[PDB]
Amino acid sequence: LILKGTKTVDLSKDELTEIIGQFDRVHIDLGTGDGRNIYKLAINDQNTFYIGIDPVKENLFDISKKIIKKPSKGGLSNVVFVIAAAESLPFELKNIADSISILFPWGTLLEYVIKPNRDILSNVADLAKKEAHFEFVTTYSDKAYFLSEQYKAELSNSGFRIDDVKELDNEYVKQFNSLWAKRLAFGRKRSFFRVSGHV
């Protein structure tokens, strides 16, 4: 279940394996949103295949129509948008990612990362390969909680070993091309949190 411009089509496990073959790394961005964060990641690193997952295709149409253009007009060969939700990830993505990111999640996905929801995070952990680097960047209102043993033990029980926790400012977030990230970055002073480590 992927997007070819504004049209939804199927991609089989084989086809995907074939594509991933021409790359040394595969990164997955969950709840990718409007696909801009992923777009910038890919354009700056042609040695990685980027998979942006999101349950709402309407928000992906623009970038989706753009990545499919010829390279001369902003097209990209290392991107694919998957239409799925954290509650039910596609089995084809099992044990495939070298790295995973969840950037500025909203709604239920934010809840799953913050609570945390061990079951849901467990399913996300299944998308990563043995190595697997991960990054969770969140914000709620405009750091000790994430460094607590409780949160650390729960994420660990889900397959996520925290190596670092950092509090980022608007200045940093101003770097993201996401319209959602920019609204967040350009507004009131706000606190951002990045929990990162390995699977």
From Swiss-Prot:
Task: Select a single GO molecular function from the record's annotations and give it.
Answer: methyltransferase activity
Query: Its catalytic activity?
Result: adenosine(1408) in 16S rRNA + S-adenosyl-L-methionine = N(1)-methyladenosine(1408) in 16S rRNA + S-adenosyl-L-homocysteine + H(+)
User: Does the record bear Transferase in its keywords?
Assistant: yes
**Residues reported in the UniProt entry to bind S-adenosyl-L-methionine:** 31, 37, 54, 86-87, 103-108, 178-180
Effect caused by changing residue 29 to A: Loss of kanamycin resistance. Strong decrease in methyltransferase activity
Give the InterPro entries listed for this entry: NpmA (IPR056262), SAM-dependent_MTases_sf (IPR029063)
**Alphabetical GO biological process terms:** methylation; response to antibiotic
Q: Which domain of life is it from?
A: Bacteria
Q: Reported effect of changing residue 106 to A?
A: Loss of kanamycin resistance. Strong decrease in methyltransferase activity
Entry-linked Pfam families: NpmA
Q: Which keywords accompany this UniProt record?
A: Antibiotic resistance, Methyltransferase, Plasmid, S-adenosyl-L-methionine, Transferase
Identify the enzyme class: transferase
Summarize the impact of residue 105 to A: No change in kanamycin resistance. Decrease in methyltransferase activity
Q: Changing residue 188 to A: what effect?
A: No change in kanamycin resistance
This enzyme's EC code(s) = 2.1.1.180
Q: What is the effect of changing residue 54 to A?
A: Decrease in kanamycin resistance. Decrease in methyltransferase activity
* Family that this chain belongs to: Belongs to the methyltransferase superfamily. Kanamycin-apramycin resistance family.
Function, as annotated, reads:
Specifically methylates the N(1) position of adenine 1408 in 16S rRNA. Confers resistance to various aminoglycosides, including kanamycin, neomycin, apramycin, ribostamycin and gentamicin. Methylates only fully assembled 30S subunits.
What name appears for this protein in its UniProt entry?
Answer: 16S rRNA (adenine(1408)-N(1))-methyltransferase
